[PDB]
Structure formats: C-alpha cells, structure tokens
Nucleic acid binder design. Structure first.
Ligand SMILES: [K+]
Ligand SMILES: [K+]
Length: 327
DNA sequence: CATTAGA
DNA sequence: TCTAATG
C-alpha cells in the first residue's frame, strides 16, 4: 500500500504504456500481474533478486526494479515520458470515443492535437465529434448540488410519461459523494422482467421525454436497453449556462432491479466485501441475481428480490445505508 | 462483460 | 461479421 508503492507505480506506468502506445497486450499483461503480486508482498523489496522470487517476476522486471531502487528513476520511464508520440496517444485518448486503436491511427496520420482534431472533424465519427465538441465539459466534475437538480428533473419526466417506472440514480452520487463524473440512471418497469419479451419502447419513451424538454441534447448511442447521451441543466436567467454532462440510462427487467442497483451503487469494495460474505452465508451475488449455493460445488435458482433489503436479509447482514456503503 | 456503432 | 469503445 505504500511500502511497495514506487515499484507498483513504475510498473503500472510501464504496463499502461505497452498496452496503449505499443500493442503489447502480453508485456502489458505481464507488468500488471507483477505490479499486482509485488503489491501484496509484505515487505520492502530490497532488490530485483528478492522481487524476483515472486510469481510473475521475471528477469526483465527484476532488472527494472534494481534501476529504480538504485536511482530514483528509470530511463525507459524517462524516455516514454518524453516521447512525443506516446504522449500524443495518451492525450487523444481523453477524447471520448477515441481509444488506443483510433489514437494510434490518428497520430499516424499526423493528428496529434485538439486543434488537429478540429480541422479534421470529417475523419471522426459521431461519438468522437461529440466527445470533441465537449472536451472541456466532459472533463469537468459534477457537483452534487447539480446532481440533485438533474435527478430531480429526471424523476419528473419519468413519472410524467408513465407512473409505473422506477428510476434510481446510482453511483457515488447515491453513496453521498460531493461530486461525480456523470450520471447513471438504472431504469425498470414491471411490465419488463427476465422473460417478458422486451418493450424497446420502454426505453425510447423516456429518452424521448427527456429530449422533448431539452434535458437530453445529444445521443452517443441509443440501443434498446442502454442509452448513452449528453444533457444540460437549463441555463437559468442568464449569465450562467451549464456544462454539458454525460448521462447513461439503462432498461432492466423489474425482476433484476435491486441487484443491479445494489451493485452499481458500489462501492467497488463494499460490493466485493458483501459478495465475499454471501459465499459464506451460502450464496451467490452478481449484477443480476442471488443464488443459493449447493454443496456439490455450485448451484443455481435465483431468490426473489423486491428491495435492497431482500438481498441483505438473505445474507443475514445489517442493512447498510447507501451513505455508508463505502466499504 | 455485455451492449452499441460501424465498416 | 468482427473489432473498437464505454462503463
Ligand atoms: K519468479
Ligand atoms: K477516450
């Protein structure tokens, strides 16, 4: 957590690189397990050699460890850090809709900047054009104070369209968080569960509402169960307009709501932790259900859930307010 | 880890 | 169809 920290940081820097700038999925996967294992190790690694006794720790890596232990640096790391191409990749990647593959290609063509990207909108797809368009706004945090005004509008049209819907704004927002990155709305309907052959409209209806009123301004991607867009709080009585925000709305079989909701509410650790416990408590949890364990090794059969509580009950735990679902 | 765009 | 990008 801190005794092996530099090594873990150097290492991830190393990996992240192979992965993006190069297409070394392997080296990349290598750096990570190592970074991973060196991270658990209970003592201060004093040399490659010592490191080396580890699993995943090759001669290539141990070598890196000495140079880093020896001198507080690493050339390779220094060289990469300097590398204009590699840097360019790292950058274009911040555009929404540009992932490594497009970054490389773009650089290849000589588009290494925001401005480059502009001159060439034509070389970009709708998602990328949008991500381009709101490069700033998308990088900006979402103050809870706004999170509350957005949730508010959302639940209102939801309800307007059909009173039968149930929406929940998940994430750190739901767990308290002073600010968030984007909003995550989990949606559901009774008239939609596991079997009941969809109702694509179910999703459409609402997206259409939100738009109708200018809450939704763009569409990054609209499917029949997952809509990914951009929204904006009505810019008041002037002098202050609001930054464009990313929003994701997703349909869900009413019979799977609470688990999904449970889950997406995190935290990553609270989850993992609760989950680890359901195992002891003779269960299995995951994004959609909760199944009882059968001694033979495994088992099936989804227990029925009507609330975040059912799940709790089941593993015989203390209901934890989202607020304190931190870990 | 599953859903969407796209070519 | 595959492959990329998001979350
Ligand atoms: K080893
Ligand atoms: K990106």
């Amino acid at each position: 957590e801190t005794l092996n920290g530099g090594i873990t940081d150097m290492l991830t820097e190393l990996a992240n690189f192979e992965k993006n700038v190069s297409q070394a999925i392997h080296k990349y996967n290598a750096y990570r397990k190592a970074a991973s294992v060196i991270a658990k190790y209970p003592h201060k690694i004093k040399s490659g050699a010592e490191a080396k006794k580890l699993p995943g720790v090759g001669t290539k890596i141990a070598e890196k460890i000495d140079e880093f232990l020896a001198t507080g640096k690493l050339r390779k790391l220094e060289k990469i850090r300097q590398d204009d191409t590699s840097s360019s990749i790292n950058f274009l990647t911040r555009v929404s809709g540009i992932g490594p593959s497009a970054a490389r290609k773009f650089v290849d063509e000589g588009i290494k900047t925001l401005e480059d990207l502009r001159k060439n909108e034509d070389k970009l797809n709708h998602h990328q054009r949008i991500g381009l368009k709101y490069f700033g706004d998308f990088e900006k945090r979402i103050p809870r104070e706004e999170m509350l005004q957005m949730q508010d509008i959302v639940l209102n049209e939801v309800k307007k369209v059909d009173s039968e819907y149930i929406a929940t704004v998940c994430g750190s927002f739901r767990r308290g968080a002073e600010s968030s990155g984007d909003m995550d709305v989990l949606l559901t309907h009774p008239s939609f569960t596991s079997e009941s052959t969809k109702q694509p409209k179910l999703l459409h209806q609402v997206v259409e509402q939100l738009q109708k009123v200018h809450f939704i301004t763009d569409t990054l991607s609209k499917g029949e169960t997952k809509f990914m867009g951009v929204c904006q709080l009505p810019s008041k009585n002037d002098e202050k307009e609001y930054p464009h925000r990313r929003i994701d709305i997703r349909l869900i079989p009413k019979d799977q709501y609470y688990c999904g909701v449970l889950y997406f509410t995190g935290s990553d650790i609270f989850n993992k932790n609760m989950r680890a416990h359901a195992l002891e408590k003779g269960f299995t949890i995951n994004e959609y259900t909760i199944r009882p364990l059968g001694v033979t090794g495994v088992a099936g059969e989804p227990l029925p859930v009507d609330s975040e509580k059912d799940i709790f009950d089941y593993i015989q735990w203390k209901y934890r307010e989202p607020k304190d679902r931190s870990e």
